[PDB]
Amino acid sequence: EMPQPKTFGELKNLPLLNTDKPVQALMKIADELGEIFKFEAPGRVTRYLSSQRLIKEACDESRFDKNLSQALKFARDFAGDGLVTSWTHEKNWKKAHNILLPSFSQQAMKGYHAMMVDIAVQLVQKWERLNADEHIEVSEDMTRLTLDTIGLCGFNYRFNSFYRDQPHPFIISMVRALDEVMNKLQRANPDDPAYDENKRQFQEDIKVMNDLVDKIIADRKARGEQSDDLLTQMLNGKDPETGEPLDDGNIRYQIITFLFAGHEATSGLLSFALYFLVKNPHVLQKVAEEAARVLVDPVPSYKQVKQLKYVGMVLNEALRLWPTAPAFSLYAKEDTVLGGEYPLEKGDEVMVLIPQLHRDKTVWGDDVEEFRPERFENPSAIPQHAFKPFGNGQRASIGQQFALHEATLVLGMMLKHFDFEDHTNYELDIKETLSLKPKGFVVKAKSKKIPLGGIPSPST
């Protein structure tokens, strides 16, 4: 039968995930045990998949469907039946999926671009205005950007994260709420009243999110619709098949969903990308060279951002080593046998462990640990389902091209305007929060003295 990691009496495998770095623990277990292993808790079993061979079968949508893991179930407390936390079969999924998909089309992306630039220009300028002693808090600043961008592009709301030294009230609540969700996974006795304090913070944090989301609808029926964005679509889009728009309840869920999904992974990507570049200076130089070659105007155009092909590779290779939404969950639609060896009773759950897929030697070669954006040079070469940072099928990220457009534009501007220094020789430390993010990653920027508008850099 299936291998299984260390067991602990009545608790079975449960205590192994009672750590702050659970995905990383699972990665180490996949290394010991191979492509598939059973994971048991009291009353629950899942199987963890780490090989292209098996993950390919799981990605067959006639045999498997999206499952909501415990984390997604918990997240429903604030995100309800928004796109991320719905079952496929729930009415609001196909309904919302159909209405909002055109908001991440080709034509819609060109419309987000000028606003993306507005936030990116703020980041650059912040770093141009640091004093000589000061360093950069990479992950902190990348989060200021990814939020402000989804806020602005999607809902025409300005969080103004760069006008605040502490993160925005809304984003402190959201992260706390996400942390609480990570915690609930670790609680054997959630009834225990020692968690009453947590239960209270969660409920106040959810109230905060919901007050903003109400203030955002205030801005919009008040605005008199200059704007033409995701919110516009939420409110006025009618489902082709059902002919009705989303009701106000779902709309509130989707706004929250897009604010949480739209910033965190993308923020981890930028941080990791910057981390790999300082640790690989020849790769940094090749990126900086592309940025100077391509970004020849004071602000990047949409077409230019598409031309940054090597930056795209750097981003995909960062997503290869550390996908910032590192696992997703499936369930067998009907009885089925997997890999010709493992029967699954209908309803049984599997877990795609994406970092391990991306380290599967029988598809990426023996090179897997080395950061080499050049693997993505001829895309066609890479087998189907060997690379899945954005999930699978109809339940794949609706936010993919947006994330990649945002990250590419930003990273390109960064390397256009700064050289970077790993002044503390940082040792990688990966915090887990439903996402991966480097923790405590700091760098120093040396300005390349290049103007943003007509306005000169601090060469003044």
Q: Which of 150, 212, 273, 332 binds ligand HEM (CB under 6 A)?
A: 150
Q: Which of 12, 66, 95, 375 binds ligand HEM (CB under 6 A)?
A: 66
**Helix spans in 129-241 (H):** 138-155, 169-184, 196-223, 230-236
| Beta pairing class for 44-49 and 349-353 | parallel
State the minimum distance, in angstroms, from the CB of residue 325 to a copy of itself.
22
Distance CA 319, CA 270 (A): 10
Interacting residue ranges for a copy of itself, rule: CB under 8 A: 8-11, 14-15, 18-20, 42-43, 77, 91-92, 183, 186-189, 191-197, 199-200, 203, 247-250, 423-425, 427
Count Cβ atoms below 10 Å from residue 9 Cβ, excluding itself: 6
Question: Residue 328 binds which entry of ligand HEM, a copy of itself, none, with Cβ cut-offs from 5 to 8 Å by kind?
Answer: ligand HEM
Between residues 143 and 324, which has the closer beta carbon with respect to ligand HEM? 324
**Helix spans in 17-90 (H):** 22-33, 52-58, 70-79
SS3 content of the chain, % helix, strand, coil (to 5): 55, 10, 35
Q: Check if the beta carbon of residue 370 is closer than 8 Å to that of residue 351.
A: no
Question: Residue 150 binds which entry of a copy of itself, ligand HEM, none, with Cβ cut-offs from 5 to 8 Å by kind?
Answer: ligand HEM
Distance CA 245, CA 397 (A): 22
Question: Residue 197 binds which entry of ligand HEM, a copy of itself, none, with Cβ cut-offs from 5 to 8 Å by kind?
Answer: a copy of itself
| 173 counts as binding ligand HEM under rule CB under 6 A | no
Q: Which of residues 348-407 bind ligand HEM (CB under 6 A)?
A: 389-391, 395, 397-399, 402-403
Distance CA 431, CA 440 (A): 9
Q: Which of 13, 257, 271, 408 binds ligand HEM (CB under 6 A)?
A: 257
Question: Residue 8 binds which entry of ligand HEM, a copy of itself, none, with Cβ cut-offs from 5 to 8 Å by kind?
Answer: a copy of itself
Q: Check if the beta carbon of residue 396 is closer than 8 Å to that of residue 283.
A: no
- Residue at token pair 């092909």: 309
| 83 counts as binding ligand HEM under rule CB under 6 A | yes
Alpha carbon 198 to chain centroid, angstroms: 25
Between residues 189 and 226, which has the closer beta carbon with respect to a copy of itself? 189
| 265 counts as binding ligand HEM under rule CB under 6 A | yes
User: Which residues of this chain interact with ligand HEM, rule CB under 6 A?
Assistant: 66, 83-84, 97, 150, 257-258, 261-262, 265-266, 269, 323-325, 328, 389-391, 395, 397-399, 402-403
